[PDB]
Design an enzyme around this catalytic site. Structure first.
Site, PDB file in Angstrom:
ATOM      1  N   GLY A  37       0.833  -1.208   0.000  1.00 22.81           N
ATOM      2  CA  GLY A  37       0.000   0.000   0.000  1.00 22.81           C
ATOM      3  C   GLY A  37       0.857   1.244   0.000  1.00 22.81           C
ATOM      4  O   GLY A  37       1.837   1.300  -0.789  1.00 22.81           O
ATOM      5  N   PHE A  41       2.466   4.928  13.178  1.00 27.29           N
ATOM      6  CA  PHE A  41       3.782   4.670  13.805  1.00 27.29           C
ATOM      7  C   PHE A  41       4.374   6.003  14.212  1.00 27.29           C
ATOM      8  O   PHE A  41       3.967   7.026  13.609  1.00 27.29           O
ATOM      9  CB  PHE A  41       4.730   3.991  12.808  1.00 27.29           C
ATOM     10  CG  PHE A  41       4.285   2.626  12.365  1.00 27.29           C
ATOM     11  CD1 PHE A  41       4.480   1.508  13.160  1.00 27.29           C
ATOM     12  CD2 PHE A  41       3.663   2.455  11.151  1.00 27.29           C
ATOM     13  CE1 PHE A  41       4.083   0.248  12.733  1.00 27.29           C
ATOM     14  CE2 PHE A  41       3.251   1.197  10.730  1.00 27.29           C
ATOM     15  CZ  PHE A  41       3.488   0.098  11.511  1.00 27.29           C
ATOM     16  N   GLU A  42       5.328   5.995  15.135  1.00 25.43           N
ATOM     17  CA  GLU A  42       6.278   7.125  15.326  1.00 25.43           C
ATOM     18  C   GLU A  42       6.969   7.428  13.989  1.00 25.43           C
ATOM     19  O   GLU A  42       7.099   6.512  13.153  1.00 25.43           O
ATOM     20  CB  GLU A  42       7.340   6.815  16.385  1.00 25.43           C
ATOM     21  CG  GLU A  42       8.280   5.687  15.999  1.00 25.43           C
ATOM     22  CD  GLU A  42       9.069   5.084  17.160  1.00 25.43           C
ATOM     23  OE1 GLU A  42       9.659   5.870  17.903  1.00 25.43           O
ATOM     24  OE2 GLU A  42       9.102   3.828  17.310  1.00 25.43           O
ATOM     25  N   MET A  43       7.334   8.685  13.767  1.00 29.56           N
ATOM     26  CA  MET A  43       8.216   9.065  12.641  1.00 29.56           C
ATOM     27  C   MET A  43       9.646   8.667  13.037  1.00 29.56           C
ATOM     28  O   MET A  43      10.046   8.946  14.181  1.00 29.56           O
ATOM     29  CB  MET A  43       8.134  10.565  12.348  1.00 29.56           C
ATOM     30  CG  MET A  43       8.671  10.916  10.981  1.00 29.56           C
ATOM     31  SD  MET A  43       7.546  10.385   9.675  1.00 29.56           S
ATOM     32  CE  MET A  43       6.169  11.455  10.058  1.00 29.56           C
ATOM     33  N   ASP A  86      11.370 -10.509   6.885  1.00 29.88           N
ATOM     34  CA  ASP A  86      11.779  -9.540   5.838  1.00 29.88           C
ATOM     35  C   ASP A  86      12.855  -8.563   6.320  1.00 29.88           C
ATOM     36  O   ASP A  86      12.764  -7.402   5.921  1.00 29.88           O
ATOM     37  CB  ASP A  86      10.546  -8.838   5.299  1.00 29.88           C
ATOM     38  CG  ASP A  86      10.743  -8.137   3.979  1.00 29.88           C
ATOM     39  OD1 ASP A  86      11.713  -8.460   3.269  1.00 29.88           O
ATOM     40  OD2 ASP A  86       9.942  -7.218   3.725  1.00 29.88           O
TER      41      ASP A  86
HETATM   42  C1  LIG Z   1       8.965   5.782   7.470  1.00 33.45           C
HETATM   43  C2  LIG Z   1       8.448   4.944   8.579  1.00 33.45           C
HETATM   44  C3  LIG Z   1       8.425   5.078   9.920  1.00 33.45           C
HETATM   45  C4  LIG Z   1       7.795   3.917  10.442  1.00 33.45           C
HETATM   46  C5  LIG Z   1       7.467   3.131   9.370  1.00 33.45           C
HETATM   47  C6  LIG Z   1       6.817   1.915   9.223  1.00 33.45           C
HETATM   48  C7  LIG Z   1       6.815   1.024   8.177  1.00 33.45           C
HETATM   49  C8  LIG Z   1       6.378  -0.374   8.480  1.00 33.45           C
HETATM   50  O1  LIG Z   1       6.109  -0.840   9.586  1.00 33.45           O
HETATM   51  N1  LIG Z   1       6.347  -1.042   7.298  1.00 33.45           N
HETATM   52  C9  LIG Z   1       6.848  -0.265   6.246  1.00 33.45           C
HETATM   53  C10 LIG Z   1       7.074  -0.652   4.938  1.00 33.45           C
HETATM   54  C11 LIG Z   1       7.616   0.286   4.082  1.00 33.45           C
HETATM   55  C12 LIG Z   1       7.930   1.572   4.523  1.00 33.45           C
HETATM   56  C13 LIG Z   1       7.719   1.942   5.847  1.00 33.45           C
HETATM   57  C14 LIG Z   1       7.168   1.018   6.741  1.00 33.45           C
HETATM   58  O2  LIG Z   1       7.859   3.762   8.209  1.00 33.45           O
END
Ligand SMILES: Cc1ccc(/C=C2/C(=O)Nc3ccccc32)o1
EC number: 2.7.11.23
Length: 335
Positions: A30, A97-99, A146
């Site tokens: 997504g 999520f947190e940044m 992963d």
């Molecule tokens: C940029 C950012 C901060 C926290 C996250 C969480 C992600 C996650 O759990 N799956 C992802 C898969 C692709 C990109 C980001 C995420 O992404």
């Protein structure tokens, strides 16, 4: 609506709370958006699961595992991304999520793929081994499935603290559901062979990751499954017969002989086990591409410990492959 992705519109407010700023990321899962949470007064990343039955069902597992991990308040849980909450919106599951800062692949791109220091590599390795120990807790028993540079983010661009993200393929021990898992470069032999797997496949991925973090390039960069198994055999030789005997996809890459032994099913590569990690790391030739020659913290003795720990993490046998606790006791980590 038309198709799987949510129409994102920068500047709109979701449910009088989330002010959409920009699209962080896209992909098969997504999308991810940067949003300002007005209630909590902070920036968050919202992961918008595709509006497709298969993706929504897998994301319920993701949410269950994330919530379980955040519930276990201990001296290990802050190497794991914090899921603040989730909600349905416009027929999309949305995970807040947190940044965090950039991923370890971006950190490689900002060195022009020369790789980071052995010292920074060891800091990443101690955090990751600690994280994997936490996942190996009985109550969790979570297989990430992963691990790769992209799925390890820096908390702060100035610092070396990290967290693991994307538990989108994660399962618990005994709840295996996909015969095809892991990014190809970081895919364990047991998975390429189509065998059952446990938490050991994460330790495999971590071995590949640590080498790539230092060399700046993937250890095993296969174009496909056959090419991937072949690049592994180049370094580690033909996998043990006891494993290949029990392996449904053994005959995809290997051949039994009258002997009773296995050989590469050749149709071209360096002979099995002749691509020495010793030479890939450049132990005695000034490190990867000679760039660490005479640098502090890049002695031969340093390299030999690093190489030893890598080879314990790239054990073909998942039963004897080094497990998180033992990895933390390795001389490579010792003061
Ligand atoms: C940029 C950012 C901060 C926290 C996250 C969480 C992600 C996650 O759990 N799956 C992802 C898969 C692709 C990109 C980001 C995420 O992404």
């Amino acid at each position: 609506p038309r198709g799987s992705h949510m129409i994102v519109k920068n500047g709109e407010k979701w449910m009088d709370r989330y002010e959409i700023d920009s699209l962080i990321g896209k992909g098969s899962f997504g999308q991810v958006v940067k949003a300002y949470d007005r209630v909590e007064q902070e920036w968050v990343a919202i992961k918008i699961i595709k509006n497709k039955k298969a993706f929504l069902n897998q994301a319920q597992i993701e949410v269950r595992l994330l919530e379980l991990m955040n519930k276990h308040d201990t001296e290990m849980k802050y190497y794991i991304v914090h899921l603040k909450r989730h909600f349905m919106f416009r027929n999309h599951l949305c995970l807040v999520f947190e940044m965090l800062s950039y991923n370890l692949y971006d950190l490689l791109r900002n060195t022009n793929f020369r790789g980071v220091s052995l010292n920074l590599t060891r800091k990443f390795a101690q955090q990751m081994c600690t994280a994997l120990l936490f996942l190996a807790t009985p109550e969790l028993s979570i297989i990430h499935c992963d691990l790769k540079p992209e799925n390890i983010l820096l908390c702060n661009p100035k610092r070396s603290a990290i967290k693991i993200v994307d538990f989108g393929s994660s399962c618990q021990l005994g709840q295996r559901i996909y015969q095809y898992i892991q990014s190809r470069f970081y895919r364990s032999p047991e998975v390429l062979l189509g065998m059952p797997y446990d938490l050991a496949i994460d330790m495999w991925s971590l071995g590949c990751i640590l080498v790539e973090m230092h060399t700046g390039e993937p250890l095993f960069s296969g174009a496909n499954e056959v090419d991937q198994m072949n690049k592994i055999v180049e370094v580690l030789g033909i996998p043990p017969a006891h494993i290949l005997d029990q392996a449904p996809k053994a005959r995809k890459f290997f051949e039994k002989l009258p002997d009773g032994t296995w050989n590469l099913k050749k149709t071209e590569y360096k002979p099995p086990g002749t691509r020495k990690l010793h030479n890939i790391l450049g132990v005695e030739t000034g490190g990867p591409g000679g760039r660490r020659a005479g640098e502090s913290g890049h002695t031969v003795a340093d390299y030999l410990k690093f190489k030893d720990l890598i080879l314990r993490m790239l054990d073909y046998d998942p039963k004897t492959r080094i497990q998180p606790y033992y990895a933390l006791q390795h001389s490579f980590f010792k003061k």
